[PDB]
C-alpha cells in the first residue's frame, strides 16, 4: 500500500490536467486506472522514455515486490463487491509482425497476468473491432464504442486503452419517494430542472476553508461493504467557481479531509446523474513530462522491440459512472429536524477505498 498512495497521487495530477482543459464541462476519470495502465507501459519502455514515466509516477515497476503489490491492490478493490457493479480493464496493442525482444511476452505475463495484444493494423477494420470488442466484452457492454479509434490506420503501431464502469449500491439507500425535480444553478448563472435524491442520516462531515476565506461542504457517503466511500465537495457560495478547488486538489488533501471528519445529522439533497467521458491522455501526460513516448523516432520502446522503432499512436481512458438511490437492529428516528445541505451547483466527487487510500474515481459535475 505504498503503491496505492503513489498511484493515486499520480492519477489525481492527471485528473487536474483533464479538468483544466474542460472548464464548465462534466468529467469523470479514474486515477487508479491511468496509474495501472502506465505501470504496464513502463515495462515496454526504456532509456529516457522509461525515466520520464517513472519520474511522474514516483516508482519503477521492476522494483522488488511492486508488480505483486499492484495485483494485491487490484483484488482488494474488486473482490469486495462484484457482479455487474464494478468493471475495469487495461490493454496495450502492438503491430503483429514485429520481432519482439527475446523473453518479453513471458516476462510481461509473469508481472501482470495478461498478454500484450498483437494485431495486424493494416487490417484496419479488423483491428478496430478487436480493440472495441476488448473494451465491450470486459466492461459487460456498459460503455459505448471508443471514438478515438477512428484515428487507427495502416501506419498505427502501438495503442493503449483503459476502461472502467461503476454503479454501486449505498450503505443506506436514498428513500425513493423524496426523489423529485429541482433547479440546478449552472456556473453561467442559468438554471435547469433536474431529479435530486434526498436522505436524512448521520454523515461524516467537515468544512474546508481555503486560504482566501471561502468555505466548502465536504461530505462522505459510504457504499455497501463498508469499504469504498463517495466524497462530495462544493463551495457554499454560488459565486465561487469549482476551478478554485480543482486547481489545488491532491490525493493527500482528500485524506486530510477524511482525517478531520465528524458524524453529524443532515438532510442531503443530491442530483441523480450519469456520466460517460472519453479522455485522450496525450496532452495531460505531456504536461506531466511524458513527451517522448508519443513521438516518432524519439520514443524509446527498446524493451518491447529492438528491431524497429515504435511510438504510442493513441492513448485513451473511457469511464462511465451511475449514481442512483439503491442500497441494501434498532434504528431510532430524528426527534429534531436536521440541518440541510443542497448540492444544486457544480460539485466535485471522489470515490475512495478508505483502507488503502486508493482513488478509484474522480470527477466534476457542471450540469447533472
Amino acid at each position, epitope marked *: 500500500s505504498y503503491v496505492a498512495h503513489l498511484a493515486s497521487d499520480f492519477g489525481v495530477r492527471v485528473f487536474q490536467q483533464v479538468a483544466q482543459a474542460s472548464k464548465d464541462r462534466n468529467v469523470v476519470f479514474s486515477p487508479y486506472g491511468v496509474a495501472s495502465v502506465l505501470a504496464m507501459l513502463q515495462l515496454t519502455t526504456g532509456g529516457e522514455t522509461q525515466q520520464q514515466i517513472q519520474a511522474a509516477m514516483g516508482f519503477k515497476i521492476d522494483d522488488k515486490g511492486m508488480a505483486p503489490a499492484l495485483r494485491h491492490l487490484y483484488k482488494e478493490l474488486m473482490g469486495p463487491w462484484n457482479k455487474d457493479e464494478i468493471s475495469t480493464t487495461d490493454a496495450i496493442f502492438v503491430q503483429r509482425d514485429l520481432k519482439l525482444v527475446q523473453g518479453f511476452m513471458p516476462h510481461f505475463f509473469r508481472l501482470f497476468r495478461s498478454t500484450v495484444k498483437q494485431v495486424d493494423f493494416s487490417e484496419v477494420e479488423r483491428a478496430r473491432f478487436i480493440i472495441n470488442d476488448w473494451v465491450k466484452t470486459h466492461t459487460k457492454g456498459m460503455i459505448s464504442h471508443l471514438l478515438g479509434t477512428g484515428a487507427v490506420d495502416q501506419l498505427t503501431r502501438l495503442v493503449l486503452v483503459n476502461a472502467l464502469y461503476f454503479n454501486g449500491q449505498w450503505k443506506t439507500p436514498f428513500p425513493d419517494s423524496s426523489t423529485h425535480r429541482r433547479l440546478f444553478h449552472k456556473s453561467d448563472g442559468s438554471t435547469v430542472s433536474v431529479p435530486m435524491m434526498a436522505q436524512t442520516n448521520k454523515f461524516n462531515y467537515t468544512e474546508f476553508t481555503t486560504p482566501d476565506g471561502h468555505y466548502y461542504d465536504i461530505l462522505e457517503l459510504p457504499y455497501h461493504g463498508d469499504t469504498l466511500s463517495m466524497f462530495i465537495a462544493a463551495p457554499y457560495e454560488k459565486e465561487v467557481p469549482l476551478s478554485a478547488l480543482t486547481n489545488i486538489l491532491s490525493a493527500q488533501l482528500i485524506s486530510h479531509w477524511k482525517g478531520n471528519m465528524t458524524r453529524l445529522p443532515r438532510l442531503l439533497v443530491l442530483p441523480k446523474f450519469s456520466l460517460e467521458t472519453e479522455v485522450d491522455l496525450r496532452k495531460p501526460l505531456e504536461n506531466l513530462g511524458m513527451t517522448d513516448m508519443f*513521438r*516518432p*523516432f*524519439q520514443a*524509446d520502446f*527498446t524493451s518491447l522491440s*529492438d*528491431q*524497429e*522503432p515504435l511510438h504510442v499512436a493513441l492513448a485513451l481512458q473511457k469511464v462511465k459512472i451511475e449514481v442512483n438511490e439503491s442500497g441494501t437492529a434498532v434504528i431510532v428516528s430524528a426527534r429534531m429536524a436536521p440541518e440541510e445541505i443542497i448540492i444544486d451547483r457544480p460539485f466535485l466527487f471522489v470515490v475512495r477505498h478508505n483502507p488503502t487510500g486508493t482513488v478509484l474515481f474522480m470527477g466534476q459535475v457542471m450540469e447533472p
Partner: nanobody
Amino acid sequence: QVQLVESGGGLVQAGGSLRLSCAASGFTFDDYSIAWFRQAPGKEREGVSCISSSDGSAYYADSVKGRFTISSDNAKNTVYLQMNSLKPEDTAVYYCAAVWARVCRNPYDYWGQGTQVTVSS
C-alpha cells in the same frame, strides 16, 4: 572530431523535388541508427525519417505518406533524404542525427547544424 554536416537546402516550387545530404567525419553510419528531423515556424522539432542499424530498414512519419526516401551510401559515408511532391506544409529547417543503438530513439549521440528548406508556391 565527429561532425555531421548537411547540404542541399534552398528554394523549391510546390510539386518540386529536393535532395538533402549529410556527410559524417570521424565515424561510419553503418553502425549508428540515422534520422532526419525538422522544425517549422511556430512548431517543435519532429521526426521525419529513420534508418535502423538493426537491419538497414527505413521508416517514415505519417505526414510523409510514401513521398520521401532516406538512404545510406556506404562508400560516401553520406546520408540522403530525397523529397518528392513538396508542399507549403513541408517548409522547415531540417536536421540530421545519429545514435549508437539498434533503433532511432532519444537521446541522440550526434546532431548536424541544420539546413534551411523553403517550399514557396
